[PDB]
Scaffold this active site. Sequence first.
Site, PDB file in Angstrom:
ATOM      1  N   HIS B  41       0.807  -1.223   0.000  1.00  0.00           N
ATOM      2  CA  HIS B  41       0.000   0.000   0.000  1.00  0.00           C
ATOM      3  C   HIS B  41       0.844   1.279   0.000  1.00  0.00           C
ATOM      4  O   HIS B  41       0.273   2.376  -0.027  1.00  0.00           O
ATOM      5  CB  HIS B  41      -1.008   0.006   1.163  1.00  0.00           C
ATOM      6  CG  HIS B  41      -0.399   0.114   2.528  1.00  0.00           C
ATOM      7  ND1 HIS B  41      -0.437  -0.923   3.440  1.00  0.00           N
ATOM      8  CD2 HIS B  41       0.222   1.143   3.154  1.00  0.00           C
ATOM      9  CE1 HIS B  41       0.153  -0.542   4.562  1.00  0.00           C
ATOM     10  NE2 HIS B  41       0.567   0.704   4.414  1.00  0.00           N
ATOM     11  N   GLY B 143       2.912   5.543  10.276  1.00  0.00           N
ATOM     12  CA  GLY B 143       4.319   5.394   9.963  1.00  0.00           C
ATOM     13  C   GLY B 143       4.919   4.053  10.344  1.00  0.00           C
ATOM     14  O   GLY B 143       6.059   3.764   9.948  1.00  0.00           O
ATOM     15  N   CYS B 145       3.877   0.989   9.481  1.00  0.00           N
ATOM     16  CA  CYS B 145       3.717  -0.106   8.536  1.00  0.00           C
ATOM     17  C   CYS B 145       5.063  -0.533   7.962  1.00  0.00           C
ATOM     18  O   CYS B 145       5.953   0.290   7.744  1.00  0.00           O
ATOM     19  CB  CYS B 145       2.755   0.287   7.415  1.00  0.00           C
ATOM     20  SG  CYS B 145       1.034   0.333   7.966  1.00  0.00           S
TER      21      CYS B 145
HETATM   22  C1  LIG Z   1       0.560   2.000   8.364  1.00  0.00           C
HETATM   23  C2  LIG Z   1       0.791   3.020   7.217  1.00  0.00           C
HETATM   24  C3  LIG Z   1       0.326   4.452   7.600  1.00  0.00           C
HETATM   25  O1  LIG Z   1       0.656   4.941   8.630  1.00  0.00           O
HETATM   26  O2  LIG Z   1      -0.513   5.188   6.719  1.00  0.00           O
HETATM   27  C4  LIG Z   1      -0.990   6.393   7.280  1.00  0.00           C
HETATM   28  C5  LIG Z   1      -1.896   7.112   6.282  1.00  0.00           C
HETATM   29  C6  LIG Z   1      -0.803   2.079   9.050  1.00  0.00           C
HETATM   30  C7  LIG Z   1      -0.690   1.511  10.466  1.00  0.00           C
HETATM   31  C8  LIG Z   1      -1.934   1.934  11.321  1.00  0.00           C
HETATM   32  C9  LIG Z   1      -2.070   3.436  11.371  1.00  0.00           C
HETATM   33  C10 LIG Z   1      -2.484   3.682  12.875  1.00  0.00           C
HETATM   34  N1  LIG Z   1      -2.040   2.383  13.583  1.00  0.00           N
HETATM   35  C11 LIG Z   1      -1.741   1.426  12.699  1.00  0.00           C
HETATM   36  O3  LIG Z   1      -1.368   0.330  12.962  1.00  0.00           O
HETATM   37  N2  LIG Z   1      -1.800   1.322   8.280  1.00  0.00           N
HETATM   38  C12 LIG Z   1      -2.779   1.987   7.679  1.00  0.00           C
HETATM   39  O4  LIG Z   1      -2.866   3.172   7.781  1.00  0.00           O
HETATM   40  C13 LIG Z   1      -3.818   1.182   6.874  1.00  0.00           C
HETATM   41  C14 LIG Z   1      -3.655   1.422   5.386  1.00  0.00           C
HETATM   42  C15 LIG Z   1      -4.704   0.570   4.626  1.00  0.00           C
HETATM   43  C16 LIG Z   1      -4.663   0.918   3.146  1.00  0.00           C
HETATM   44  C17 LIG Z   1      -4.436  -0.922   4.811  1.00  0.00           C
HETATM   45  N3  LIG Z   1      -5.157   1.585   7.297  1.00  0.00           N
HETATM   46  C18 LIG Z   1      -5.567   1.376   8.543  1.00  0.00           C
HETATM   47  O5  LIG Z   1      -4.863   0.860   9.358  1.00  0.00           O
HETATM   48  C19 LIG Z   1      -7.018   1.820   8.932  1.00  0.00           C
HETATM   49  N4  LIG Z   1      -7.771   0.590   9.199  1.00  0.00           N
HETATM   50  C20 LIG Z   1      -8.723   0.333   8.313  1.00  0.00           C
HETATM   51  O6  LIG Z   1      -9.018   1.101   7.456  1.00  0.00           O
HETATM   52  O7  LIG Z   1      -9.343  -0.825   8.436  1.00  0.00           O
HETATM   53  C21 LIG Z   1     -10.411  -1.005   7.533  1.00  0.00           C
HETATM   54  C22 LIG Z   1     -11.709  -0.366   8.083  1.00  0.00           C
HETATM   55  C23 LIG Z   1     -12.313  -0.885   9.221  1.00  0.00           C
HETATM   56  C24 LIG Z   1     -13.486  -0.315   9.705  1.00  0.00           C
HETATM   57  C25 LIG Z   1     -14.056   0.773   9.050  1.00  0.00           C
HETATM   58  C26 LIG Z   1     -13.448   1.289   7.910  1.00  0.00           C
HETATM   59  C27 LIG Z   1     -12.274   0.718   7.427  1.00  0.00           C
HETATM   60  C28 LIG Z   1      -7.017   2.689  10.209  1.00  0.00           C
HETATM   61  C29 LIG Z   1      -6.013   3.809  10.016  1.00  0.00           C
HETATM   62  O8  LIG Z   1      -8.313   3.205  10.410  1.00  0.00           O
HETATM   63  C30 LIG Z   1      -8.934   3.042  11.697  1.00  0.00           C
HETATM   64  C31 LIG Z   1     -10.151   3.972  11.751  1.00  0.00           C
HETATM   65  C32 LIG Z   1      -9.445   1.619  11.901  1.00  0.00           C
HETATM   66  C33 LIG Z   1      -7.977   3.387  12.842  1.00  0.00           C
END
Ligand SMILES: *[C@@H](CC(=O)OCC)[C@H](C[C@@H]1CCNC1=O)NC(=O)[C@H](CC(C)C)NC(=O)[C@@H](NC(=O)OCc1ccccc1)[C@@H](C)OC(C)(C)C
Lengths: 306, 306
Positions: B41, B143, B145
């Site tokens: 990603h 950050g 990931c």
């Molecule tokens: C690693 C990369 C990063 O930092 O990108 C920042 C823009 C992060 C690690 C997360 C951030 C906070 N703590 C962590 O471990 N990974 C991501 O940001 C993910 C990127 C996706 C393209 C895989 N996104 C999330 O982690 C996101 N979860 C998520 O969307 O799950 C799907 C979902 C579940 C329920 C409803 C809608 C979507 C997080 C950031 O979102 C929350 C709201 C769940 C925290």
Amino acid sequence: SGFRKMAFPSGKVEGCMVQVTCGTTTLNGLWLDDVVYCPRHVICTSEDMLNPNYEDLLIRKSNHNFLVQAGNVQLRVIGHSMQNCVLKLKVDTANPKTPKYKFVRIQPGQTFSVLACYNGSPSGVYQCAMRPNFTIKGSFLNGSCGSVGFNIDYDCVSFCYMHHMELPTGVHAGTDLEGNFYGPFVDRQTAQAAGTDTTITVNVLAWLYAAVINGDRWFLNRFTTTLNDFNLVAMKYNYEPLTQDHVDILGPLSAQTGIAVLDMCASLKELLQNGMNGRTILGSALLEDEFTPFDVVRQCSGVTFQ
Amino acid sequence: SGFRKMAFPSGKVEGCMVQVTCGTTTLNGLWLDDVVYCPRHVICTSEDMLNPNYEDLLIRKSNHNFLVQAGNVQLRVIGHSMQNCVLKLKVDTANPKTPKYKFVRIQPGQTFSVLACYNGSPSGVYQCAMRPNFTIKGSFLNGSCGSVGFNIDYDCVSFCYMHHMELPTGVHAGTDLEGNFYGPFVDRQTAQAAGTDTTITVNVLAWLYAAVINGDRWFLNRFTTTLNDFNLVAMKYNYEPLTQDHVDILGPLSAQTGIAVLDMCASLKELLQNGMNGRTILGSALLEDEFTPFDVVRQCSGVTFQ
Ligand SMILES: *[C@@H](CC(=O)OCC)[C@H](C[C@@H]1CCNC1=O)NC(=O)[C@H](CC(C)C)NC(=O)[C@@H](NC(=O)OCc1ccccc1)[C@@H](C)OC(C)(C)C
Ligand SMILES: *[C@@H](CC(=O)OCC)[C@H](C[C@@H]1CCNC1=O)NC(=O)[C@H](CC(C)C)NC(=O)[C@@H](NC(=O)OCc1ccccc1)[C@@H](C)OC(C)(C)C
């Protein structure tokens, strides 16, 4: 999000661990530049355990009575001296992986990472606090002496602990890197005991703030307390007194969460008087006191889950 | 003595962490020989978060669209390919600190060490288990990931986890090092949720054995149980079933303590039906399930405190 007992990355310290042998006794040493630091009881025999005279034991040794092993290479001792309860072995080779480092003596309630080592080989890393009674609740077996505790700040390793001994209650005692024991302990096998311990109040409060930052508010209440009245409750539950300095240290956490320090003290008082009632806080069923305010800020997001 | 959540020494992994940048997105990569592994990603934009087509996004990239930074040196990408949910960047330089390593996909209930990293720089280490619902209760911010989970066996690093995402309950999800997610999750920001979790029964039992080894017997009783009747109680308290394989795995711990596995199951049943009654076990006020039998043997003395 999340909150875990988090050690510092241990690589900078793993590169400094060696094995020190004198006679038939083997333990761990810390190799920094051209000096190896290790507990002086490596010069003891089975008979010199109760009341050894280390000055007398040491004058009986030569440089070639010590063997230092780094990985699978031998380091030659070219000089030796005792400093309090540590031995310093001057070696013919400066450690090429010496990190930027400092020796620091920590206050009670401060935390540090421990690299447990056996025969000069690192085996594990965990997080410890210096208890108010100057013991640590560590994990140490025979052969672990000379393992060190440390903090890391911008690639500078601050060494703060070297392991020497276990007490009957299973807690651990050791020295700063200049060989001064934390607490009233001495490195001989005469009867010694940990004093009564107390809970590190400022750390509990920091940890409640961590819980708020990570989105949990269930334990908060609408009440406040004075510093004096809080400490009257603190005393009753074997908590350390909270000082104005502790209040000021918690400032940033208070500001990020919008919860005044003395408001969080009224929450803690309620938790102490009522328990958790089957609930957990950050996954814990008791009040955790081995996270400093600095540990919370280091691990938690700077934006609270509102 | 003592018993601590103990990570593996992280030095061998710290030497492999790099920063990967594509466009304006930056995350962590794992540099092994001349390949950098990172979550795919990193090629997403702010618009390609809901339903990105990564094959389509990736064919639009060139080698020079990726920047790899190891310390303060740039590594030139000379080739790229996607493998499931990981990107592999071939680089012009083989990592000189590549440890002996394997990629392994772990079963639920297995533990591993996590090196949390930000911008290619390690920040902390903690111990995690793969929950039965294939999440981990980690500590991860923006950050993080590309941070990896690992075990270490005789200087061979077995990488088992790469971090990708956080779920709404605050638990974490990611892949093996070949990019296959643990659990049913996918790397897009569509609604996903952790399944109901269960307690890892074999690990609780291992941890009770650790407590016996370290001298604590207060929770034992004179009763035994059958495997079938235990599991009827296990089901009732949201514990995983105990198999004959789990019984055999606990063999060595049973033998060192002299407590038959099914006798310890009758102790656990009593703890489940009655609680701890204000008491702690190895300092914990709840039953810990993130120590495998192998973790106990690794940390505990081989001679029980009789
Ligand atoms: C690693 C990369 C990063 O930092 O990108 C920042 C823009 C992060 C690690 C997360 C951030 C906070 N703590 C962590 O471990 N990974 C991501 O940001 C993910 C990127 C996706 C393209 C895989 N996104 C999330 O982690 C996101 N979860 C998520 O969307 O799950 C799907 C979902 C579940 C329920 C409803 C809608 C979507 C997080 C950031 O979102 C929350 C709201 C769940 C925290
Ligand atoms: C490190 C060196 C080593 O392994 O030597 C083995 C012969 C160990 C680390 C200990 C061993 C087990 N866990 C640890 O952390 N340190 C020592 O062995 C100490 C050497 C002394 C010369 C300092 N001794 C002890 O740790 C000893 N404690 C002790 O004697 O305390 C004084 C005392 C208190 C009450 C009554 C009598 C004496 C341990 C090994 O003894 C027990 C009984 C307290 C466990």
